[PDB]
Amino acid sequence: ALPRLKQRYREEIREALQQEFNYANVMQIPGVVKVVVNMGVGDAARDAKLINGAINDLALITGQKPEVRRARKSIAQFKLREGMPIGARVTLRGDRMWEFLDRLISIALPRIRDFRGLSPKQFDGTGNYTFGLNEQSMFHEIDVDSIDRPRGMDITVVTTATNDAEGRALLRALGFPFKEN
Amino acid sequence: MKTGIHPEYVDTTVQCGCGHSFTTRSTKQSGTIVVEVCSQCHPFYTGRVARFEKRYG
Amino acid sequence: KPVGQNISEVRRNARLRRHARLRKKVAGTAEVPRLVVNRSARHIHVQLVNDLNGTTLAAASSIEADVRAIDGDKKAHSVRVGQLIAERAKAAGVETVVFDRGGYTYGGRIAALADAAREAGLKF
Amino acid sequence: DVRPKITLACEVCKHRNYITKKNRRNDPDRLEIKKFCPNCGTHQPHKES
Amino acid sequence: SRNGRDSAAQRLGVKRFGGQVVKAGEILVRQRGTHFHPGVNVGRGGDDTLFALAPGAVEFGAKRGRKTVNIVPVARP
RNA sequence: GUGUAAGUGCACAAGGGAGCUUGACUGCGAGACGGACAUGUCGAGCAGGGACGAAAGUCGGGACUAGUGAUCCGGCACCUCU
RNA sequence: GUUACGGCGGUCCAUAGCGGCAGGGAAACGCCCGGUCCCAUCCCGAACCCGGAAGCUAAGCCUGCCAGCGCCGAUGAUACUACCCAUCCGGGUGGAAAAGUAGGACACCGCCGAACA
Numbered sequence: 001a002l003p004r005l006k007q008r009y010r011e012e013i014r015e016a017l018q019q020e021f022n023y024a025n026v027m028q029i030p031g032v033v034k035v036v037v038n039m040g041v042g043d044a045a046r047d048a049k050l051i052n053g054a055i056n057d058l059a060l061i062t063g064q065k066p067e068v069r070r071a072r073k074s075i076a077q078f079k080l081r082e083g084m085p086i087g088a089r090v091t092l093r094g095d096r097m098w099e100f101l102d103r104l105i106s107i108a109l110p111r112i113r114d115f116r117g118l119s120p121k122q123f124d125g126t127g128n129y130t131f132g133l134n135e136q137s138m139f140h141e142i143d144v145d146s147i148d149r150p151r152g153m154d155i156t157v158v159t160t161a162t163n164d165a166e167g168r169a170l171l172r173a174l175g176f177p178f179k180e181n
Numbered sequence: 182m183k184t185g186i187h188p189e190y191v192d193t194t195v196q197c198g199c200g201h202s203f204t205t206r207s208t209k210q211s212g213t214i215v216v217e218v219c220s221q222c223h224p225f226y227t228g229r230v231a232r233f234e235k236r237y238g
Numbered sequence: 239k240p241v242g243q244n245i246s247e248v249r250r251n252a253r254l255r256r257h258a259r260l261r262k263k264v265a266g267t268a269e270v271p272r273l274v275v276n277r278s279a280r281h282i283h284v285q286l287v288n289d290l291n292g293t294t295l296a297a298a299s300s301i302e303a304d305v306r307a308i309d310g311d312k313k314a315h316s317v318r319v320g321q322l323i324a325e326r327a328k329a330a331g332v333e334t335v336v337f338d339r340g341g342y343t344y345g346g347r348i349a350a351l352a353d354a355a356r357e358a359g360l361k362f
Numbered sequence: 363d364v365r366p367k368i369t370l371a372c373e374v375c376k377h378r379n380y381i382t383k384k385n386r387r388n389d390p391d392r393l394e395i396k397k398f399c400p401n402c403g404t405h406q407p408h409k410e411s
Numbered sequence: 412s413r414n415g416r417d418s419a420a421q422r423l424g425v426k427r428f429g430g431q432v433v434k435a436g437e438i439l440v441r442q443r444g445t446h447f448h449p450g451v452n453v454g455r456g457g458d459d460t461l462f463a464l465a466p467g468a469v470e471f472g473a474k475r476g477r478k479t480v481n482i483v484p485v486a487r488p
Numbered sequence: 489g490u491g492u493a494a495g496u497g498c499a500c501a502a503g504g505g506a507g508c509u510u511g512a513c514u515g516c517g518a519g520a521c522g523g524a525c526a527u528g529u530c531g532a533g534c535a536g537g538g539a540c541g542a543a544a545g546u547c548g549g550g551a552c553u554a555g556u557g558a559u560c561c562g563g564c565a566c567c568u569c570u
Numbered sequence: 571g572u573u574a575c576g577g578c579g580g581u582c583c584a585u586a587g588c589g590g591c592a593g594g595g596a597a598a599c600g601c602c603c604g605g606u607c608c609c610a611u612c613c614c615g616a617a618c619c620c621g622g623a624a625g626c627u628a629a630g631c632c633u634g635c636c637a638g639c640g641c642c643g644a645u646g647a648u649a650c651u652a653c654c655c656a657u658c659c660g661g662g663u664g665g666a667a668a669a670g671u672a673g674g675a676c677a678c679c680g681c682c683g684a685a686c687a
Binding site for chain 5: 520
């Protein structure tokens with residue numbers, strides 16, 4: 001079996017992009033590469049338990065155990081020291097990537113309160129989109145009664161595209177609820 | 182695939198307000214999953230002078 | 239025009255770099271030549287190098303039709319290639335060699351062919 | 363003090379000795395390491411005294 | 412005045428120069444870093460000291476941008 | 489960036505990470521550097537018994553150069569000495 | 571012996587690098603397909619490893635051309651300097667820079683193997 005988003009991209013999105021941009025060789029078609037969800041606690045510098053709550057939230061939402069990022073620089077304004085856990089990170093590739101993308105697009109984004117769309121201006125040169133949530137309640141993989149403190153994210157979708165226009169085209173064809181500019 | 186480092190998976194029917202049985206794997210153990218809204222039914226996927234005229238005309 | 243490097247660049251540069259980093263401790267002589275392996279996704283190749291003179295005493299590969307005729311897996315092809323290099327070294331008079339893994343992990347096909355050279359009469 | 367010279371004798375009699383130092387607060391418990399013993403010609407572990 | 416303190420001279424430098432014949436074990440240079448790198452038949456000590464591993468004549472060469480010291484096995488009479 | 493001053497080095501890494509481990513060994517040591525002397529420093533290699541490694545091999549503390557005190561006197565452990 | 575071929579090495583390791591333009595996939599070199607087996611992720615079959623060849627030269631790779639950026643670089647002269655004259659000033663004999671300029675340069679050599687003879 002194939003995830004429906006991946007099957008859709010294989011069949012119709014590829015031909016749509018090929019018609020739109022007229023790539024010289026078959027393997028210029030821009031595709032998704034990986035998805036990274038970053039949850040930087042920052043406040044975990046005092047109490048470690050915040051990093052554990054972040055670990056559980058990420059593991060529940062993505063489905064795989066997240067990796068704790070160490071602080072690679074000491075700072076005094078944030079009373080940071082090298083080596084304590086600051087934030088988590090998950091790299092999603094392949095089938096798990098596609099499933100997660102389907103879940104997010106079709107369930108999580110519409111569940112956001114007074115959702116008005118995500119700006120299509122967040123790409124950077126190579127068409128790797130990155131937005132950020134403020135809480136984790138949109139996903140039903142978590143329990144509202146279980147959660148106690150909001151924890152936002154930074155979802156970044158790195159693609160094979162070379163330009164911002166191609167990246168936004170691929171994401172819009174995928175079903176991203178962009179705004180209009 | 183490491184056996185004991187990740188949670189469970191199960192084919193669950195995802196339900197929306199439109200009335201669609203969505204047979205696909207999920208982690209929720211309800212067997213059938215119900216959501217109120219999704220892409221199929223979401224709306225995104227789917228002057229003072231005037232006030233004077235209303236009041237007095 | 240792709241924005242960054244291709245994955246082939248990363249792989250090739252990393253392999254050349256980590257082959258060079260192990261060539262520090264491994265160098266071949268006339269009586270103790272360096273047996274360097276080059277492995278692709280489709281084939282495997284070996285040579286016997288005397289590093290002082292920069293020559294090659296013996297060589298073997300899965301390109302050769304005689305070893306291509308075997309129907310075994312990639313591991314079987316590597317095993318037979320190891321046998322070929324072993325008996326060619328025997329015909330070359332070289333008895334002891336030093337195994338140069340060419341920057342690849344000593345496992346799978348390369349380990350199979352190195353073992354194959356070992357029990358075929360090459361002490362290394 | 364800190365890092366005092368410590369004495370570790372061979373476990374199997376002969377009271378053969380090596381000396382070294384360690385943090386007595388990083389390693390408060392007695393140190394155990396395996397070392398060559400000349401008379402036995404063998405590698406036995408040595409217990410800090 | 413705060414100043415007035417200095418350490419002893421360490422007598423570092425090159426001990427045998429190019430063309431000098433040496434015996435095995437003979438110290439070639441006394442250096443702190445690896446200003447000269449070991450070449451053929453030349454080893455490196457704990458304090459980055461170069462010494463001869465075989466008898467012969469000292470030869471200063473450059474290998475891949477680094478100055479190196481090698482020993483040439485002078486021909487037996 | 490290299491625990492620590494400075495300098496000489498180190499990107500081939502000597503810098504960052506991971507697995508196993510105790511060579512932070514015993515008997516020695518060709519040949520040397522430096523030196524009034526006393527001090528000090530490097531050292532291939534041999535043997536025993538080990539660690540890591542598929543193997544070649546490397547390991548007689550730490551990238552290197554500071555982190556120390558002669559003789560006398562006395563304490564402790566062992567010795568097929570008296 | 572030949573080929574726009576693949577590897578292993580070199581050279582007081584850029585005269586070689588970088589950049590631009592134009593090409594190619596015979597065997598090879600790769601990208602590529604998948605995670606069933608050896609094996610792997612401080613999470614991720616991304617990488618490592620394994621199993622295959624549907625597609626592709628878009629990249630890598632290599633081929634030809636550009637001095638463009640970097641790089642190499644004289645001779646002469648000068649700075650400086652050993653010795654000797656010279657009361658100072660300076661001079662004679664010998665050595666001789668750096669910078670700059672003319673220029674060079676889009677690498678060269680070696681050993682195997684592929685395909686062709």
